[PDB]
Amino acid sequence: KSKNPEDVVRRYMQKVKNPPDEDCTICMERLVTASGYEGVLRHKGVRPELVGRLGRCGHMYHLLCLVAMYSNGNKDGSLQCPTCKAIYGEKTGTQPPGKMEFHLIPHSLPGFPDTQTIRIVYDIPTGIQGPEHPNPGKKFTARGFPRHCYLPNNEKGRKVLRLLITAWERRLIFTIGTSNTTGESDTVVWNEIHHKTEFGSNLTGHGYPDASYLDNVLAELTAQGVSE
Numbered sequence: 001k002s003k004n005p006e007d008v009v010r011r012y013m014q015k016v017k018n019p020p021d022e023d024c025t026i027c028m029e030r031l032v033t034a035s036g037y038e039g040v041l042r043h044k045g046v047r048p049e050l051v052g053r054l055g056r057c058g059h060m061y062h063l064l065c066l067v068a069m070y071s072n073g074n075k076d077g078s079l080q081c082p083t084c085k086a087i088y089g090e091k092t093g094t095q096p097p098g099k100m101e102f103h104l105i106p107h108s109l110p111g112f113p114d115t116q117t118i119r120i121v122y123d124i125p126t127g128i129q130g131p132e133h134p135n136p137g138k139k140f141t142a143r144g145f146p147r148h149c150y151l152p153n154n155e156k157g158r159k160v161l162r163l164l165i166t167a168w169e170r171r172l173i174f175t176i177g178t179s180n181t182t183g184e185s186d187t188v189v190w191n192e193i194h195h196k197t198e199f200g201s202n203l204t205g206h207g208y209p210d211a212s213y214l215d216n217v218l219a220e221l222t223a224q225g226v227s228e
């Protein structure tokens with residue numbers, strides 16, 4: 001679905017014909033007068049007097065104000081109510097094309113005796129940045145692929161796997177930007193969902209044992225809108 005500010009906001013806002021004489025808590029003008037936003041998106045945009053009720057919570061704003069607020073964020077397809085902090089829509093990312101594969105291997109991770117291991121492989125080729133990327137039309141590099149990572153095959157690890165698959169489909173596992181490890185720009189980097197790439201030790205900090213990891217990555221997934 002379109003992630004553009006006007007389309008996203010219009011998707012979740014229900015028109016109010018007779019708004020009350022109360023403050024829009026985005027622009028702090030009354031809902032019965034024009035939006036206080038005067039930036040570039042007002043020109044030939046949403047009529048400034050239009051007011052809507054947002055999503056399930058029903059909080060009311062000038063439509064133009066929520067368009068501006070959404071535009072000043074990540075524009076990831078999710079829309080947060082500034083009053084009650086409920087989030088509407090599905091957060092998706094800018095991960096480029098590639099493949100995600102997984103299967104079981106007959107080896108136990110440190111701290112998970114008597115288990116098999118879910119081995120996940122991500123493979124992302126180089127390509128051309130799209131309009132969603134920092135430098136559209138410029139090449140992006142993809143270093144160190146295929147990238148292997150590991151989860152124990154237990155109840156919680158399988159839950160994490162299910163959610164990682166969802167995050168992958170929502171283009172949230174990788175992004176295009178600058179590597180904090182190499183300094184290279186215009187390159188495919190891990191996003192904000194940590195993966196364990198070191199199997200039998202934790203000298204890198206990205207390995208095992210780590211008794212907190214599964215709960216930590218579940219929290220990271222929830223923060224990116226990926227929950228069960």
Ligand SMILES: NC(=O)c1ccc[n+]([C@@H]2O[C@H](COP(=O)([O-])OP(=O)(O)OC[C@H]3O[C@@H](n4cnc5c(N)ncnc54)[C@H](O)[C@@H]3O)[C@@H](O)[C@H]2O)c1
Pocket residue numbers: 143144145178179180181182188189190191192194195196197204206
């Ligand atoms: N030519 C190469 O072999 C080459 C070059 C660059 C990166 N890489 C691979 O990518 C890693 C660097 O990460 P990046 O450039 O994508 O993003 P990054 O360095 O900008 O870090 C982004 C996120 O990924 C985490 N992260 C960093 N290294 C990780 C690792 N080995 N395993 C799991 N998570 C890691 C970070 O904590 C952070 O949360 C390298 O360690 C390597 O595995 C390989």
Ligand SMILES: [Zn+2]
Pocket residue numbers: 024025026027028029035036037061062065
């Ligand atoms: Zn307003």
Ligand SMILES: [Zn+2]
Pocket residue numbers: 054057058059081082083084085086
């Ligand atoms: Zn609300």
